[model samples]
Target: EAGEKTVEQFVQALNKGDYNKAAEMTSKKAANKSALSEKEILDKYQNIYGAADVKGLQISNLKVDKKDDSTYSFSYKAKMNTSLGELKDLSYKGTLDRTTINWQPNLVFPEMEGNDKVSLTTQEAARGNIIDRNGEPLATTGKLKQLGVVPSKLGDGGEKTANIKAIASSFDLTEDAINQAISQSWVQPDYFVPLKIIDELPAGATIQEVDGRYYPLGEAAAQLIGYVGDITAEDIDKNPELSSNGKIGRSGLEMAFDKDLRGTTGGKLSITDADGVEKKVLIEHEVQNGKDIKLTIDAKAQKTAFDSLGGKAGSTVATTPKTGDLLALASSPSYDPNKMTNGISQEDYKAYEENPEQPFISRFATGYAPGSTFKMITAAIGLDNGTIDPNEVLTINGLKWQKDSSWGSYQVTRVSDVSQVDLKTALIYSDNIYAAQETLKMGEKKFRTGLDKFIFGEDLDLPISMNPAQISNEDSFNSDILLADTGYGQGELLINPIQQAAMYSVFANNGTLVYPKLIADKETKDKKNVIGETALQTIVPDLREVVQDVNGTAHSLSALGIPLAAKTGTAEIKGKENSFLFAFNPDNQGYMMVSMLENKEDDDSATKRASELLQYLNQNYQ
Candidate 1:
């Protein structure tokens, strides 16, 4: 019973993580007759146990045998959990009395002896690369020039103040940030304190080369590849496996594949003697480099597609119609991911922030009112549902027509005033009135049911996150007005570029919607039939004339001298419009593309952009 209460109290405090309280109950005389203060006793326990990430401690089989009136021999076994493994049955022995515990460092860790210290060494593993199908690197690690300062170099008095302010402005850092770095306890006047990563150095600033993420395609692929940044404390809370010292994927494919791309960081947790010789190795982990993620993107096609957008705020997508291999995903007004990974200046980041086009936004991941490019889908649905006859001509009164007077003032408008209209004439002229009427004939229930086959309201089987394509705000339309507008891709309808490309693939793949994929080695899924042969045959030839006939709105694409079929649409929104072109190489079914331009200067802007991109693909990549 001697010293049992004191030992028990010490274990309780230690298990509660209160090293200070635990040390208070310990003897002032440590090993080798050295007198240790309470702080010194606390420091030793904190250093070793804390470094090992020790938790869930249990001291079992406690025995106290009275050796004399003043001292008792105490023995116990310790068990605890750590990231390395379970440390169990570590036997400890010491001398104590009923009033106080006489401590030695070995009682803290069985292997530790006189003033032995625990040391942790960590090495970050190399982050993975994002590669294209051709084995070209899209995102990889490289060295960047870091701008820093030697505080002593700034001279004395007012000159030092002037120089720091000038350096702050030049590097786009606040004076407080520079001062804080200089004020850090570990920082020295002569030491280089890193401020920012930069391409060109400013005067009076020191340069240091540091390894960081690099983007080969720059703005062209930033939206698709994303970038990495330092891990936050909140991030550590959510994912305990993550190291606080390492970088983490922030967006796009980087975020999507973060776990696999961020390989395990190697570390050594060990105890060393006062002489710094390793006494015991607590745990050691070998570095496991991150895996490279190969994508289905064709670097050339992706670049060309981005270039074709000509700095507009829109997106372009390309796919192999038959195979569903996504070749290119381009969104204009993109930011440099390299700048994001290293350190983007406040001024530069503010410029992006202030830009109305929102350079940080990935338009390909967002959905939009697809406009008349969706008419082909409407035609297919109407044909399949037996509500439309391709040969039957109807006499529409004018360019605009409403369902009835009961529907107040809303009217379906058209670009052409051709009173006589058929399926071919409707598509070639891009007549919104004709599409609305046909959809009204199909009604709401059949239209919603028909849309289910197009993957509406479902997540895409892709790595990049995106909201599903939607028919309307709710499950059903509130009125025929909204239903008619939705027939031509207006109203609350929103379809992302990826889904739009998939929808258009049905025409090129004999009435089946090809399953689009981003990963190079992703398993193939069976093609789904959106329309039968009868519906496909009726609508496809008419789609071809939409680019072939001289009167066709998209007929200018014929100038490319390729057997191309296309549909041009201009979605009207609050007096502004978005131009769209969905085109494919019909002769061999080599490629299909969907290109859109926000707030276009002309109706043919999207058409011209798609045509120029197709010509480039034909010349180089196709």
Candidate 2:
């Protein structure tokens, strides 16, 4: 509608931005008293709000009041949304000139106030630090000058060619890397290209360098600590808050607790124009730096085991039995985070992918037939249920044996020859027959129930993806024969180093399942639904006999000088064998560990390394 009398016409013209029409509507008297022409009025309004990117508009609660017979009152609400934010709840009052039948708003032109160069901007928040239990930084932020050449500064095919050649000669950098970095890292014009995050200050003062997130421990806790890199297109699409150049976790703890470590990315709302020039400054959201996190890993212990592996494909997981805090998780064939500092080469990347050692695979997460490591579970269950006598002589004359027709066709075999095999002696030598015999005595139901006390076939309670350990259940092993096979950890018995460590740690904690914890200040102790005294009759000096007894299988460990409750297992899997050892130091009294080497059909022994590592761990730490 037009304005009330002449004013209504002018208001309508001004509201719709019809400067020519508004001048026509202005009465002869109103224009003379410095009220200015419509073009002049519209000029200032455009200067104030026209450049603003209005996002939306809403109108509400229009009310009309008829007062005197000659006139009426009008009121309405105004709301406007712009790129900066919403300008809302604006109220207006107007008059209806009854004689002319037109409405006149009190103000002809609105939205012009103080202008202070309004603008809007988005800035990313800095990520938080990740630390060890000792309050030490593992993944921390530091300023770094990333290596790269200015493609513009690298002017001529001649200028670029000479610099690329010089930098490529440096041990880590390459010519192709410079080429790729320039192509990808430099997007906007004259942008400083990042060849690689500069960890060290080298020559070339102008080389583009910026602070970035990094891992300090390198390959030591490589898989567990993970690393940070650019957020993907897919990730930013899902989360608009994330910027394209900002970082996101790639894997491991970095990926697991990303949000906690990644702080807020703040933004600002300011006055701007259509060409995207910022005019004023304001804070819509404030930047929040990421908070630090502490993990329970003992870095000293983690390094000790990881370095001793000699490039083998294996894993070691150590945990405090009573408090259930993980001390170390070491896996071999890993790449140092520093190696990735400059860049990863196609050859190096390809070598890692095709390597049989599987550097990327966390062995503790991948399940294996726990081998004779599961025998101790058999011993603990049998002794607790009164189905076993540690001194009872069970015959083990041959490599294999079959019970009468009532037992079906599963065969129990011995790795060694000992006719007078008592339960204590069976464990010392890892007598598979002795273990299987005890399983038959407990039967399938009792045996399966015994494993439940250890949380067998349960989740590992670790934060990352891990294999669930399983034992042959009554359903899977309804036959008496399959049940016996599970007793010695052969038929369908599955577990990982973490599970094995926990199982043996129960002995150190006196038959309780002190669950593992990877976070600091989170110590918890709980019984694993069992009586704690079984190991007194079972192992310590009992299994230590294996380390010193001339006939003992683990006698090689006798010289290591730490008394341990230990068990050894070698399982034949897919024509390849996996060697595992579950051992605990009674002096430390609360930590048990599983040391394993995958597919070790070689001369080196997994148990030997485990024994040495155990001895090293006990002497070096507690």
Candidate 3:
């Protein structure tokens, strides 16, 4: 009985991690040679067991035999789940005194207590190239001289003015423009100031070769391809792979396809010793270069479209109606992207900042109030939803409708006159009243569904960022006034030029809305996915009426002498007329385009300006 109680007490003491109590239950050491206290004798047992990190310990299958009168032998299976590993069926034996009930036998644990770690290092991947469908470089690292001012060379503002005058006059630039570029932000007396990319430099100016990016076509490919610059410490901090000397894409396609351009990074695993030295080579991996990304942009079409803008402050888009292949997307008041890459002066940036027209902004992807261009949407949704018939008659309250409209906020007016205007007549005259009536009938759900088919008010994964064009708010659809406003391309109905081109594509495309494709292929050029197809059959004849009906809105295009489908929009805002035109060759190659001629000064009607552009691209297409 005393043996059983002593064994039980020892187990309970050890299990509770009370080494002192368990030591007291141990035998005195080397009793034959004069002895040590039991606690001191069992010090080794406590130390060995104490070193291990322990958990889930259990002892079972116990057996005891009363061997001699003073000592009883015991055996048990010791098992435990541990970090070092599991202890399975470990046979343990010990003896207890029948009189004193003191236990001793040696017990030890040599496992646990590890002390080592891992370290990692990496290498950045090679950057990819952005190629055109023709396998030409749209954006790639190349060499071209960036033309700008050298503040260190200039003696003063007067010298800078003289040097700028020499370069600007040589380049046929006005003083106001040269002044604007140099007056930008972050300027210092010693920084290399960049004005623009030029063919020839002022003889005394510094001409350093850059191993970095260069836009070959200069401003011609500016907004389309974008630019790159040195990596900032802030960016490097966020991206551990990025080094202090790294370069990154800043805007346009360069920004959109940056990840594809950045190749895979490599790394190594090594074991280190106590002195923090590499003790052994664990693993090594090779680095990989980035992918070569391609785009669907047509070099010729892009150049031609850019030239066709006549260097104004508007946007132009050209696309293949059948495949939604974006051929060209151009905006005016543009700049050479390379000029911004390395040495832009503080004043030059400030000049750009103050400019009302955003030349840096990619207008093609950004949304704008599309004026009468939206009427085409109104007409299609109206017919598709059976809200209006082709010959359905409706009278306009003159060119200006003050009454009989759900919207009493303002009077509605058309491009021409007011009279008995049916769908065809209203479309021809670009009548706001007629279109607004169509919008009122289709209502919210039908209009929203129609616009959704073309991807309005929805997230679009374009090759670049595009502002989502809003037509109707789900929360505010009950507002008939806003719907009437959208009918004539006003109110919350904003659209990107690319979107308009896609919408117009439905006409030539068997009523299937063909989505626009920007990338040349999807292998590495992936994720700019869009809606593939949708049916919108009713508006083909209505749009065909634009050119074929002669009385169609842009009937003026008939004189150009090619089978064409067209729709013209004359949107009046802030007391200024902004002209918009949606047209395409109706032949087997319906090369559709959306032309926007917007200016605060009301420079010229888009119909005439865009006609020449239309002719220029049509000629280039041939």
Candidate 4:
């Protein structure tokens, strides 16, 4: 019974990885006549098992044989899972004498001796590659340009000090840092002391190529692809296999799919004699390389869309309307992700940190007040509820109107002052008053029910993260003014650009909403009919007129010479204007795109950007 209690304590502690406790339960001295402290025993056991990254250790099916009154011999089967793989049903033995257990190096390994040393040899697995739909590389292992100075070229000490100071000021780093870098023991006068990875080289610095992760798309795909950095202590705490010397995903899709992209590390642990000759092969595992990921993004379209932004603070999203495959996701005012991988310089990082446009901010994953682009959804809801008629024209007096005197100074305004307005005229002119009246006719309950049909208030199914689209902060609108404002896309309505593109698919799919697809092999979710065919038909013709009509808000896109349906809007935010445009080809139904520009000086900026992208798509992709 005493033997059973002692074995339970020792086995439980060892399995729990409390090596110090397990060692304390063993004898004070080893079979080699060497005194065994807890540290020595723990370190020895850890060197063997930890080197293999072993987990789930177990010692079961124990058979204790009585050797004498005070001594007990125990035999058991050992099993464990390791990075190399699993080992099961291995026979091992130990001995215990009343108060203290008999300890030996062999107790840890099958035939380990006190003078033997355990050695672990490891090989890093290759990180996975990320590619676009066309199989073009997005992220891969390649040589990166490292910017540094060759001390020998700077002349004497005075010239060197002056050059270092100038370089420090240029990169926004301290002069002392440059001094310390060149003073390192390994740094020779002719050696390339890499200080940072930069796109533009300083006057005195030269470029050197070093192996690292590379992003072929550069700034165009920075926000979407993200980048890798050194693993953190926190990461090692959670994942023992992760090394501080290794790289890990920092954000975006890289962070989301890190586990699959970072393959298991391969290693071998063995017992070596005093002469450092291996005596036994304890455990060995082959490296499992990371899995390659293919995304639905189109490289050409992505670059084109990003270039079209023209240094503006905005986003553009394009997708196949029928299949819901995302073609391009571009955010402007973006920084080069290649610079971020190795650690950006102070000047480079500060530019992004202090810029008013906030280049690091991802606009595609963010939600905003969609403005007139939301009019189509409002019109669809009105048509589905029988609250609007395509032919019935309503006489409106002016550009702005309120429900009643109860509305006070708050009023709904339109861009055009046309008196006779119907479903067709309203959509063509982007009439806010027309949308307001129709929404009031449907009232709060019916309008909200209509909105419930679309995907909202939930996370997107894509690998990347995004803010969920929300109708309002509260369950329902408190007043008619709020409801009327919502009709024009102003009152608390925030819809992500991705979601906006998906909703517009209803017109392309005969009133069905197609789920957005990111990964090429990812299965598309079943489509659902969010708008009825009757209601879709009522609005689609006029939507085409939104771009085809001479006076249409988005008629600028007509220059592309494609049969298209579109909408354009301006959202007023604290006196600043945000331009929006949603466009698609009706004949082919090949692509649908949504573009938005923040603080745009001209209302047509988003429309112009979309025109440039659509023209490109029509020329090549179509």
Top-TM-score candidate index: 1
lDDT of 2 by residue, 226-342 (tens): 777656546654554554346778778888888888877667655454455665443376777787888888777787778767778788888767777787888887876655533
- Which of the predicted structures, 1 or 2, would earn the higher TM-score when compared with the native? 1
TM-scores vs. true structure, each candidate? 0.80, 0.73, 0.64, 0.77
Residue 512 deviation, candidate 1, in Å? 1.7
Q: Give stretches of model 2 more than 4 Å off.
A: 1-124, 142-145, 150-160, 165-193, 198-210, 267-269, 273-283, 338-342, 404-411, 588-590, 620-622
- Expressed as tens digits, the lDDT of each residue in 107-160 for candidate 3 is 333121122223445565557777777887776677655555665665566766
Summarize candidate 4's per-residue lDDT along 265-315 as a digit string, tens digits: 677777899888999886676788899999999988999899988888899
Q: What C-alpha lDDT, on a 0 to 100 scale, does residue 164 get in candidate 1?
A: 88
| lDDT of candidates 1 onward, in order | 0.81, 0.66, 0.65, 0.81
Flag clash pairs in model 1. Answer: none
User: What's model 4's overall lDDT?
Assistant: 0.81
Per-candidate clashes, comma-separated: 0, 16, 17, 0
Top model number, lDDT: 1
* Weakest lDDT window of 10 consecutive positions for candidate 4: 27-36
lDDT order of candidates, best first? 1, 4, 2, 3
